Amino acid sequence: IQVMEEAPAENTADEDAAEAAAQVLSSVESEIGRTTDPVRMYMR
Amino acid sequence: IETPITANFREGLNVLQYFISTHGARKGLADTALKTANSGYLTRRLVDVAQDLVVTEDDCGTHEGIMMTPVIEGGDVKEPLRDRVLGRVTAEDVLKPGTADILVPRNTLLHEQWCDLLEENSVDAVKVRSVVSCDTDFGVCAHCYGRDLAR
Amino acid sequence: IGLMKAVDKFEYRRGYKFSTYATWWIRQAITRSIADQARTIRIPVHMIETINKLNRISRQMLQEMGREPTPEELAERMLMPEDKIRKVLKIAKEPISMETPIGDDEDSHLGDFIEDTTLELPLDSATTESLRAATHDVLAGLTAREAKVLRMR
Amino acid sequence: VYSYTEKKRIRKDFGKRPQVLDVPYLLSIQLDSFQKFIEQDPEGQYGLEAAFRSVFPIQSYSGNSELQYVSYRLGEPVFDVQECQIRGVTYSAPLRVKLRLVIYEREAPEGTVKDIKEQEVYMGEIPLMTDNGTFVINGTERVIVSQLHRSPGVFFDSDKGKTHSSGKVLYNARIIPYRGSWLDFEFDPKDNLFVRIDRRRKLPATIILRALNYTTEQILDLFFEKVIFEIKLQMELVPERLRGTASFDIEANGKVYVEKGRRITARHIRQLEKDDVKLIEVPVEYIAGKVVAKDYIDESTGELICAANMELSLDLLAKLSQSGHKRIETLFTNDLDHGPYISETLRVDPTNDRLSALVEIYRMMRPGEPPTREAAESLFENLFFSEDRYDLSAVGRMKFNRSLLREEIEGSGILSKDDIIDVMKKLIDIRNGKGEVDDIDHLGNRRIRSVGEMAENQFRVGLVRVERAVKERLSLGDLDTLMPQDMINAKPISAAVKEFFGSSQLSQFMDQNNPLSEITHKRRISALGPGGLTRERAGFEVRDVHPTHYGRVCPIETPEGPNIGLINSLSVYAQTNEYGFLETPYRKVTDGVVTDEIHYLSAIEEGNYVIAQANSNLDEEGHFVEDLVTCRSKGESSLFSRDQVDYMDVSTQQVVSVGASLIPFLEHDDANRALMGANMQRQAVPTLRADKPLVGTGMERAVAVDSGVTAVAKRGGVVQYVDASRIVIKVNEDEMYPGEAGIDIYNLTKYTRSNQNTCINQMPCVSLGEPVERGDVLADGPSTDLGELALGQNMRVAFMPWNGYNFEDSILVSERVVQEDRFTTIHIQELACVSRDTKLGPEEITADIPNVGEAALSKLDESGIVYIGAEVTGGDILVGKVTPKGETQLTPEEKLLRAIFGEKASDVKDSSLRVPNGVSGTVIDVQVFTRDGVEKDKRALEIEEMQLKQAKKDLSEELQILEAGLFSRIRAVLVAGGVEAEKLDKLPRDRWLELGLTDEEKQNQLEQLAEQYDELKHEFEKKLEAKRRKITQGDDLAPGVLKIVKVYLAVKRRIQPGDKMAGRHGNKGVISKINPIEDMPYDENGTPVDIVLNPLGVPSRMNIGQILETHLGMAAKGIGDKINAMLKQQQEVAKLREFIQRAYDLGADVRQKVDLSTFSDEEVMRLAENLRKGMPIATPVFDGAKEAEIKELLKLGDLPTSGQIRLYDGRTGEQFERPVTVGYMYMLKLNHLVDDKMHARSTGSYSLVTQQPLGGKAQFGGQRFGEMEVWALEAYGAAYTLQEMLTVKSDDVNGRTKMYKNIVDGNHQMEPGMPESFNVLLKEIRSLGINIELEDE
Amino acid sequence: VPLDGGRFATSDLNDLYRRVINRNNRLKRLLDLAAPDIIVRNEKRMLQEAVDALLDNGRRGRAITGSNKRPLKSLADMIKGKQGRFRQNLLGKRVDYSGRSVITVGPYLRLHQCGLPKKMALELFKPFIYGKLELRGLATTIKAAKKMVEREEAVVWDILDEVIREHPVLLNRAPTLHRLGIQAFEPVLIEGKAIQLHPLVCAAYNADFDGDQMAVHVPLTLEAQLEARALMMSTNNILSPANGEPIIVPS
Ligand SMILES: CCC[C@@H](C)[C@H]1CC[C@H]2[C@@H]3[C@H](O)C[C@@H]4C[C@H](O)CC[C@]4(C)[C@H]3C[C@H](O)[C@]12C
Ligand SMILES: CCC[C@@H](C)[C@H]1CC[C@H]2[C@@H]3[C@H](O)C[C@@H]4C[C@H](O)CC[C@]4(C)[C@H]3C[C@H](O)[C@]12C
């Protein structure tokens, strides 16, 4: 996908990558306090 | 813009007409660059796809091919048969328009003399051997390609 | 780790506030580290102390001189033989990144312009083989025993 | 009346339109800005005063102590500009600020203070700007270009039916502060307003209103109007409200007003208003869909019957009626115009109270932290509304108030509830069709920031950092005997300034090809830089040319490449307002008369007038001649009646820049070629002798003088002394300043190196006793001739093919052009030799070098440095140096060889400086810098002695010439009031100051005071002498270097095939051949042609200004050849006065009028000797010479009016058919020399990690062979060529030495091997966890 | 690598390796002190982060920066990218025996010949000149030959004219858009510093004479010379490979 802070070059993504990204994307919503930061984990 | 520039360069453009012309100039200058960058993308992608295709055989021995006829868009003909058929190899015998006998037997590279003969007989449908329908494995044969076009 | 060191060496009988028999053991351990593993080219704790002292004595001299001090005035203000100051003022700062962008033409990095100085030039490798031959000629043009004498010597 | 320098050579001027406004100083954008920065403003609003007042005073915890700012000053720079350049150090002044620490004691905080400590602290050095708009940073001259950025304020924009499949237009609104956060108000496709705080997640707009202590009632009162209802069931009717499709038509007075079904029209409203309708009865169902306005409660039990903003139904109406409620309120909302966008936002509002809103904002900004009432209130109150963290500058308030249609320009720099509500109302009105969005390309929405502003914004940053540090320091202790000197360290403050001036995108090396490049570099506007755009995200919207550029930004001159349209040039008359907006002058027109008073209008202020064109014929009294005159209204142009115009363009040049206004016949060139021509004219290289243009536009003198390459007279006078190096002017008595000596000295800049390694040389253009006035040029700089810019040479050119030697754009040149040195240039380069101290011992500079056989040691002196004046060539030694090497380990045959011949090891290297191969010049300068501890070898002492002698001689010559002027003036004063004439000269010179005057006693005390003042001046000059003998001080050489020796070589480059030449019309080419003179085409008189150009290049490239320039140059040179003849046949002035007056009077209603009847005879003959090589001609940009005038001028000389003569072939003598076009064209030598572009490599040095040929010419690198060339070789069958290009020629380490040995053996065969780009790849993959290995055959 | 003035330049991998080693040593030391499990868990997390930054920096974390604010370059960053080895170096490297210059017309030339500056050729063909000098007895050894060519003796020009006699050179113009952007020519030694290009070849290169430059390479092996003469020579390539029409038409 194109972040493009502004509104708008070909597709080369394997479906396997696609399906896996979809599943992890679903998990993000179901997540509660996922933290990928050591200092933050340490404080907690 | 509805009003044109009614002056030419032998005369002079006044300041307003020159100010109008500046837009077109800068637009063209900015375009050219985009065109260059976009033609490079296509070429890189097309050599990535087709880099390892090589002529690896002399004659696969197939009997199939495309059917070349002149291309006509409604009115006149914009590409005759000679341009489309020159330099290729026939897949089937080109029967004389009277259906009498074979004009070019088969597997004949159609050089200029043969094309002149075809124009003489006014035939407008020739079946030629094509790369896309070659029986060779991992490569292409010389007869399904045609001729070099540079040699 | 300094905190662990404190807890094991703390005596409550003297009634010291820990939060004080530790706030030291902790700072000693942070500074010892910042000195022993903060630079790619390790410097002794003594040299680091000296460099920090000079960088300070220098700030004060600049504020009261409206001008950077001179290796001579630094030596005078400090207690150093002047040449020692220049040696400590040479301890190169941290190595530069070899990927530092130096571009605007081809996107080339700084490490691309650093040459190899331990390489033999090809006219010196051809010259060497030419001598290794010529020697065979002038020597062969001699009798066996003397030629072998020269070869062995 | 003509100027002295301009009466020596008057340029004939076409150009029928008169001049009302003279061209301005072309460097006032740079010089005004920095004066406003470094300068003292009482009402501190500009420069450093503003920053100090904005940061100081600094307050610590509990206000126990305060640090007040009093003033500031700048000290004198230690080194002047020339010493800064020679010594390689920044030219700057030290900033010293007097602060005051005040301490508050206990008891009453706001009362007596313990003590006040006042102290001056030195806080960094600020670079100073030269008198030409440049800075010296590290000995190099820099230019800091201006920046065009978007102005702070409120801007309403939309999506123009984009990013929406439906095609709906979503409108937005953004507040942009000078420094702060970006508020916003955008529309969701469901028509709901959502404010985005800092590019964060959007939330409904109403949240913010609730965060501003607003209730729902107040929100509705502000946004919606009110519809009242009474309870039978009567409603008050307003005729205007029911404009119109109604459920119930009307029921007023019972009888009739209008039937049902029919929509209400205008006439119905007219009848209702005429009948005074105020109360009506309507069915209950009509209110079935409305919304109650305010909260309605029941008095029986004090229960809430219905809250505000709730749909009203029949049951609620019945309950209210039976509960005693008669007055029921609702809200208006016609979907067509006054639609409802706030109501939905409230209904979808996740907030009911301010605290919840603050908590939500807290989570959005910094999610995950425990929200707290005090913390959230503080965060919101600090985000905006805080002077420290949010500034809406004076320009921002003006562009905000004006956008919302307020009457106050002045205001507060912080937001408020009123401002936000008004922004919301304006956006809603836009969404309702009232109003329009803004164009973000309009030069009324773009601002210019120049060096003073950018520099003060970086000083304020440093001041903020230091203020934070000081606050921290005073947060603890607050002890006494703490002066304000230990708290302030200068490095943090100076870091920002040094980094900005040194390494920044807008601070760049000045262009010193010629005067034009400097001038055009200084007045340049860039859209890049910090706070601006970037190349990747620019898009073509901002690269276009807008209608508002007219007269402000040049549409022609812009680079062609990655950033075209992002960098522009300031137009000739364009100037900046008090707020940073380009504005341009217009000549005011009263009812009918075109007055002569100019108003400077801005881009937006100009939209609502009708401005006539400069080429608009006017009568002798100012009235427009034609009934209808073409003018440009708001956006477009069209004819207007003469009686409804109010402004007129001030000139025909005011649209173009200075570079594009130097092209004659610009109207006849295609725009692409004009762009190319301006860009190339910026690149011309000055030549040994300068040549004025024969065909110019009149802008040459302005560019030459407003650049500083020339010496211009400050005050008038008579030239007392002239020399190749200085000029001494004896000023007129009218401008003496009685305290002065009366003479001024100009020191010319002799051969000196520019940033492009060209030569900077000034030579005088006056003579002894020659009367000068103020503004007259005294010495021409590079590329100037008698005060006029002169970038090239006048070449005799013929347009014809000639044998394929001008095939594409190639140029054929004569050998007479190369013999006469017309395009020979001087290039100065400097080389350095540094002697460092290695680990094995210091390096030495010596004349004794190992393995050098006295062949290349002749030019060196006894100290090891070349003599000054030596003619060196490639490979010669300039400075002889040796480096200590240790050990060797001789091979087994190198030991035997050393034995037989008994030759021992040198033990030192030969790391000496030598001339780069291919260069050949003379050494014109050598300078040596040594550390403090080093011995200052003999040559260094010689140079120091020479410097001391030169400084003493110059200072003493200054003092004695000034004394001579002083004594002469005193003698002149002594002619009256006790005059001695014969006896005055008898007494010695020293007894002038003791000469008496009228008798008195107070006069004697003044005499003694004057003697004391004179002795003090003597001591002053003596101490100056002492100071100068003191720059014998050691140098601040970088660490590890003992000394540096710099040598300056002056090469003289001639013209040769491969050099690039150009005209002023975008016609460039490469010289292809230098042709003998007997082989060039010639005319019937035997004169050959200098240059032969190809005609086929003109038709396709529609730049036919070069043909007209050639014809007019032929005419001008014809006039010049008829004067050479009369001056060589020694004819009388009467005859030269008649002809030279017939050529200065030719034309069709031209504005110029030269009267050669007021000229002396000595002045008619000095003009005729300056016009004997061609009469100069001026053809303004869009007011040029008509072709008929060119024909007439050709006829004044004896040349054919066709412009074409008949030529003969020099090789055969046969005349060409169909005569050819010959004339004179102005050619430039562009700075693309084939000397600097030819490079060949066989073998050289290699890179360390990727052992590949190095890259470049200095490194003597190789050629890059990339993918598209690999594809080309694969398209052939060239597999061996590819293999040897990939391995043996690039990075096959042991396969490249074997190839060399094989080549020198006559055996052309390779053993390729494996590239080292693959071995490194294997090691890098293997140093991950992967195991990649080469499989056995 | 040491630089001038005592400065040192280092690769970013040294920083990452030092990080990994420091955290590993600290973890080993901390395991022997029987520290509370919070400390050892945090140390193990740090070690994991350091190793992941070494192998692939900023793939899951945010990043790691050095003295500057730029992210450190990791092992994965040295293979991938548009600058990585698997790209840049391996098909787009610098080459020996090459040089560029400006092009002029030279209308007197034949289609198989190009004008080459004598000075550019005395450098490109240097080893050939040394070999042919030593083979004719002009120079006793190779150092002698190096000084003879350095002094530019008279015999050196004759030897150069002999070396260049039949030895093609490849000429290439910037955007190689098709295979006619590299072609082989026989050199003709000329004065000056600009290459002369036969007019009829310009259309193939899309080249004009207003400042354009060309690169020249010299084939070394016998096979490379034969390929230049038989495959790439300009007189063998007069038809366009796109269409059989001639590409050498007068312009
Ligand atoms: C702006 C483009 C980047 C590049 C041109 C700039 C950025 C940082 C600069 C280097 C560093 O300062 C460290 C050293 C300082 C010494 O004094 C001279 C060498 C040294 C390597 C510098 C040369 C050059 O100037 C550098 C590489
Ligand atoms: C356009 C960017 C400028 C770039 C080409 C300039 C700017 C600084 C220069 C380097 C520094 O001097 C540090 C090293 C000094 C050694 O002696 C030679 C290599 C070294 C990298 C220099 C080569 C080159 O000259 C550099 C990279």
Ligand SMILES: CCC[C@@H](C)[C@H]1CC[C@H]2[C@@H]3[C@H](O)C[C@@H]4C[C@H](O)CC[C@]4(C)[C@H]3C[C@H](O)[C@]12C
């Ligand atoms: C009344 C007019 C005075 C004027 C003619 C006299 C007064 C002082 C004289 C100059 C100074 O002596 C300094 C230099 C001395 C050198 O020897 C020759 C040049 C030099 C500039 C002199 C030229 C001339 O002689 C000057 C200007």
Ligand SMILES: [Mg+2]
């Ligand atoms: Mg070109």
Ligand SMILES: [Zn+2]
């Ligand atoms: Zn086939």
